[PDB]
Amino acid sequence: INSALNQEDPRTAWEMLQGIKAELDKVQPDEQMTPQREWLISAQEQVQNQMNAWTKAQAKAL
Amino acid sequence: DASSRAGGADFLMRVGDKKVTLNGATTTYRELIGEEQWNALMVTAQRSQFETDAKLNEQYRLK
């Protein structure tokens, strides 16, 4: 999860997080909230913040 | 049981205003339970949907 949060492109980080969620679905095969799904929700929120900061730089360069 | 299921908040909110006779006294289901106990039950029923369903929590938090 931490390596997926240290990517330069947020679009790659999002897909990496989706892959990690798919991996986790095989060890927690139910619907309740666990402290490990909170990890992934927080990671996705952080990736959204990173996308905001990334669009700053892209717009400035353009 | 109803506090731990989706849609149980609506059921409990509707049933709190209905009558029951126990020990020779006729009360409502909200009066039979305590006032603070009823408020705690309401909070549990409203918040349990986001603990027994990670999909809802993820959807709302991402929104």
Place this chain on the structure above:
Amino acid sequence: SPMAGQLETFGGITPKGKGIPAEVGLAGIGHKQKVTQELPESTSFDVKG
């Protein structure tokens, strides 16, 4: 595709959930460009005597 339904249910938060494409999770997040193609115009010193 025969696997169009298996790909959408890949990466969900729960095994009954659906994965979120980046075009939807990151949708709406962006910044406008402050520079436009509205150029300044020059005027000629035209005196017809």
